[PDB]
Ligand binder design. Structure first.
Ligand code: DCB
Length: 300
């Protein structure tokens, strides 16, 4: 129903819109690393998330390093499984080239170009797909102008040769927080968005003001990863600040994906240790984070 109703997504005046030009807001879940917690990514779990939580997007977090794609490229097949499930379930799907320790997206740019050629060839004639080409650039030596924008200007053409206008999300500096610099030096492609990531353990008032600065430059922002936890993914749950961010995102029409769908013993994890990887979770099988996130998406 979601994809049939909204169809082809695009950016209009800095806003995500559907094929009739109306604003749309995606809310859903990210997987954790597919090399670690891929068992939670399947048609049945995604269907449960769609039906019981109300998700309209799912993010497939394919780590590149940390035992991910570069080390063992078999994980690309799990991305394909996720994309195919999203197609079958009529929801949107984010294909996330999940850089992190490999902090400069240029390190594996050749592999990224090949991977996005393949994905865009396979899936470029579906409206479901959103390409996220570099999760979290980070480090003081990785800047928008010198590293990230030129990387994007190599990968985006590869995608566009196969898929002229599905959305592309481009990471920003400082773990996808530095939307200020990106917004001042935007990419040419009209269907690009910049990633902004937050963690509710961080006091967020200035970060909200920076997102607003970026929006005021006409940049589109997708909050492709956020957590209820500290920036490590752990250390407590911070629901008061999470709610402030939830309300902010609704006011600004910002789409989002929560980190993450796993049973790992960390505060950002949505599931408790015994949760079935194919869905059907009772209240006792959701963590405090998962319970909150499910409520937010159901309310929506
Ligand atoms: O300082 N920050 O702003 C900041 C922000 C985001 C961020 O990292 C980002 O946000 C979460 C929480 O840190 C990471 O997930 C965590 O990845 C760890 C390393 O794979 C895992 O062990 C852990 O289970 C998992 O929850 C994501 O991969 C990454 F995109 C990191 N980081 O991972 O260091 C730092």
């Amino acid at each position: 129903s979601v994809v049939e109703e909204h169809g082809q997504l695009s950016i209009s005046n800095g806003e995500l819109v559907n094929e009739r030009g109306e604003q749309v807001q995606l809310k859903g879940m990210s997987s954790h690393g597919l090399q670690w917690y891929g068992q939670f990514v399947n048609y049945e779990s995604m269907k449960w998330l769609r039906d019981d939580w109300g998700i309209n997007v799912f993010r497939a977090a394919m780590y590149t390093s940390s035992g991910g794609y570069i080390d063992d490229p078999s994980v690309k097949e799990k991305v394909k499984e996720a994309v195919e499930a999203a197609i079958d379930l009529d929801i949107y799907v984010i294909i996330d080239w999940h850089i992190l320790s490999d902090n400069d997206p240029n390190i594996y740019k050749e592999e990224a170009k090949d991977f996005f050629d393949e994905m865009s060839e396979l899936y470029g004639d579906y409206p479901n797909v959103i390409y996220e080409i570099a999760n979290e650039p980070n480090g003081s030596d990785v800047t928008w102008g010198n590293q990230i924008k030129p990387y994007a200007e190599e990968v985006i053409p590869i995608i566009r040769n196969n898929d002229p206008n599905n959305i592309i999300i481009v990471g920003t500096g400082t773990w996808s927080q530095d939307v200020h610099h990106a917004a001042d030096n935007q990419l040419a492609d009209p269907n690009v968005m910049y990633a902004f990531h937050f963690y509710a353990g961080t006091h967020g008032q200035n970060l909200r003001d920076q997102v607003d600065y970026a929006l005021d430059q006409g940049a589109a922002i997708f909050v492709s990863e956020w957590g209820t936890s500290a920036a490590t993914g752990d250390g407590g749950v911070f629901l008061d600040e999470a709610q402030v961010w939830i309300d902010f995102m609704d006011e600004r029409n910002l789409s989002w994906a929560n980190w993450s769908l796993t049973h790992k013993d960390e505060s950002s994890a949505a599931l408790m240790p015994g949760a079935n990887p194919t869905g059907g979770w009772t209240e006792a099988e959701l963590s405090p984070s998962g319970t909150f996130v499910r409520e937010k998406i159901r309310e929506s």
